Amino acid sequence: VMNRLILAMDLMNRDDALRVTGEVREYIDTVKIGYPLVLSEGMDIIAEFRKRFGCRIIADFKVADIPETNEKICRATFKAGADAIIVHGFPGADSVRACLNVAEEMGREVFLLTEMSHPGAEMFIQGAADEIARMGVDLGVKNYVGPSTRPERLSRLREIIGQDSFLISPGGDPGETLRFADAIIVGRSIYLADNPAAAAAGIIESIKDLLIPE
Template sequence: MFLDKPESHIMLALDTPNRKRSFEVLDETYDLIDAVKFNYPLILKEGLEIIREIKERYKLKVVADFKVADVPVTNNRIIELVKEVGVDVVMVHGFIGSDALLELKDIASNEIGIIIVTELTHPGGLEFTRNYSEKFAELCAFVDVYGIQAPGTRPDQVKKLREIVGPDKVIVSCGVGAQGGSFADAVDAGADFAIIGRAIYDAPSPREAVINFRKVKVEQ
């Protein structure tokens, strides 16, 4: 629907420092990955239009990992802005609540999928977000949005959250690669897409890095 059926199961986190490096990395990898994810730093530096350029040039599905987390009027404006540049999926925090999520879903219509962040992947994610991750997964099913983010650093949690949201929701898993999460373990636990950033774009050969990840999954 919003994302194509996974082939490589790899979503590239394009947390590169600038436009030049972004295009260099994608020139090497675009044909081996399923989608590309943007976070705030690159967009704050280069502007939203880089999303449109990359989508048109590489024909990739695009996820805006903006972790939307405000009152409905502000959230809705963010959705309208990313809709203009062709974003396919937006990641939002579950703690904004069901009313805000329902408004986002309405604004997004059938053009943008909503993914709820359940749990942050670093150690601090266990302090607060872990306490509510299952509730956020339940919220995904309750408001019937596209899917959830689950921590690739904790495959047991991915498996647990998959059981909650069921087989039809999309799960994307952050923290794979540089943060220590295993690509194969995250996918085997139920993630549709493993989000991989530094382990690819900081590698001497980003293309070779992607190929190696794909080999590991095939060998499992």
């Protein structure tokens, strides 16, 4: 949200993760954290980022279980401090709804992952992408996460979810991506930079130059 830039904190050692995040806090307030960091350092790391830096945390857990278990995963995740959680749609409407129910009760957010673009994604994901996105619309999902690369797929997703829905995705960027996504997710280009704060600053400048309405 802040500056339409989300940091994908994918480092696995706690020191570097905390260091880099604090260094860019001036320009980025939203950070995405996945399982590798959480499983190695504990869920308390989420609480630490929020408590210590006041950032918003998106748990990229790609939740993909049956309804009752999804509910428990979301509860434990929101209890630990996450503001939002990323959920798979392939498991069906029921499994997504369970996540929406907990988010509703706790005042948090669910991001629906509609497709992936890694090799192998063409086997089952690509073919179900539009239908999964439409299922999200039918479920009242308001936040979506896009695959990656291929700007043409992004345009398609936006057409399905509408102008009102919130869409985030990784990376002529940031411009190409932000023609359709509301915020761009950036990891390496920032956390592997000699001066992370400088890299974030540079990208934010590019983003502001776009003069994006609303």
